[PDB]
Curated annotation (Swiss-Prot):
Designated name of the protein: Hepatocyte growth factor receptor
Residues that bear Phosphotyrosine: Y170, Y174, Y175
Outcome (variant: H34R): In RCCP; causes malignant transformation in cell lines
Mutagenesis / variant outcome for changing H34L: In RCCP; constitutive autophosphorylation; causes malignant transformation in cell lines
Effect ascribed to mutating Y170C: In RCCP; germline mutation
Organism: Homo sapiens
Entire protein: shown range: 1061 to 1346 of 1390
Residues of the active site: D144 (proton acceptor)
Functional description taken from the UniProt entry: Receptor tyrosine kinase that transduces signals from the extracellular matrix into the cytoplasm by binding to hepatocyte growth factor/HGF ligand. Regulates many physiological processes including proliferation, scattering, morphogenesis and survival. Ligand binding at the cell surface induces autophosphorylation of MET on its intracellular domain that provides docking sites for downstream signaling molecules. Following activation by ligand, interacts with the PI3-kinase subunit PIK3R1, PLCG1, SRC, GRB2, STAT3 or the adapter GAB1.
PTM comment text: Dephosphorylated by PTPN1 and PTPN2.
Mutagenesis or variant effect for Y175F: Complete loss of kinase activity. Alters interaction with PTPN1 and PTPN2. Loss of interaction with PTPN1 and PTPN2
Length: 286
């Protein structure tokens, strides 16, 4: 049943050549490698192969196939596509993604050799909002939305993605898995109710999106640098937020304040964020 359903997601050695010698990135989930996908005509597609080195038991493997079925359906220009999954008889399972020429958004904006304007940064955030509006229409909760998980392709199109631990189905398993592997929770990106109740919704993704807008307007600065991870909840309960960046227009900072509304039901939806940020974006010349 799950096996029959996941077949269209599986790719194998008849199409994929993983270059285990060419490492793109090292993480808590395993490594990312350069890959080559040859289609039926014979043409080459450059890709990134994420290895999920911790998935071993029946319950982990079955949750992974379920996630592949969900993520294989994704088709939106601001959402990183899933090319397929490798279910090898030997070796850890692999996730095959399209290769992103300019890396992750945080690295791109933090690099001293790159000089993006304020309009470019607002535009990058507008692309993330469009990608999240699509995810939210599928009832897909990100849980880890941050500038480090937004990729930039050869055309400077932002793709919403995740380069962390394997995705789980239940919020109870999300904390359980982070504690079992020593991977830190993305505390400074979590909504107040997520920090206190351990649950995640699309409204808590809207909170993380506000932090991502703040990362873009500061060119990759760490949020709440002087606030300890364990002091974040009291800081937020006191009504304190991230301060308005130096080159951030007043209407954009108002949008961030609405994302960080203590009442989750009062935050804007991603559809409202797309409408609001397009209006702000158009007033910027260039
Ligand atoms: C398609 C893409 C993607 C696009 C937009 C949002 C998200 C997201 C939000 N919150 C968690 N993920 C993921 N994607 C998919 C996988 C993936 C593929 C197949 C199976 C599993 C099991 N876990 N992850 C799997 C991956 O590793 N990385 C990645 O970038």
């Amino acid at each position: 049943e799950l096996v029959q359903a996941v077949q269209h997601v599986v790719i194998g050695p008849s199409s994929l050549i993983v270059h285990f010698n060419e490492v793109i990135g090292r993480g808590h989930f395993g490594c990312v490698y350069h890959g080559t996908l040859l289609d039926n005509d014979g043409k080459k597609i450059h890709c990134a192969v994420k290895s999920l080195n911790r998935i071993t038991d029946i319950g982990e493997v079955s949750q992974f196939l379920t996630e592949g079925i969900i993520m294989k359906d994704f088709s939106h220009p601001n959402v990183l596509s899933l090319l397929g999954i490798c279910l090898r008889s030997e070796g850890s399972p692999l996730v095959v993604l399209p290769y992103m020429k300019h890396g992750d958004l945080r690295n791109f904006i933090r690099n001293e050799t790159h000089n993006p304007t304020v309009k470019d940064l607002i535009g990058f955030g507008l692309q993330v909002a469009k990608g999240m509006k699509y995810l939210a229409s599928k009832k897909f909760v990100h849980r880890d939305l941050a500038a480090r998980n937004c990729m930039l392709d050869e055309k400077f199109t932002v793709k919403v993605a995740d380069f962390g631990l394997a995705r789980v189905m239940y919020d109870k398993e999300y904390y359980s898995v982070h504690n079992k592997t020593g991977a830190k929770l993305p505390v400074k990106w979590m909504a107040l109710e997520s920090l206190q109740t351990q649950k995640f919704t699309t409204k808590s993704d809207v909170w993380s999106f506000g932090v991502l807008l703040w990362e873009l307007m500061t060119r990759g600065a760490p949020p709440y640098p002087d606030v300890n991870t364990f002091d974040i909840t009291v800081y937020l309960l006191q009504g304190r937020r991230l301060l308005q960046p130096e080159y951030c227009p007043d209407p954009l900072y108002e949008v961030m304040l609405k994302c960080w509304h203590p009442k989750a039901e009062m935050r804007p939806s991603f559809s409202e964020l797309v409408s609001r940020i397009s209006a702000i974006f158009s007033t910027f010349i260039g």
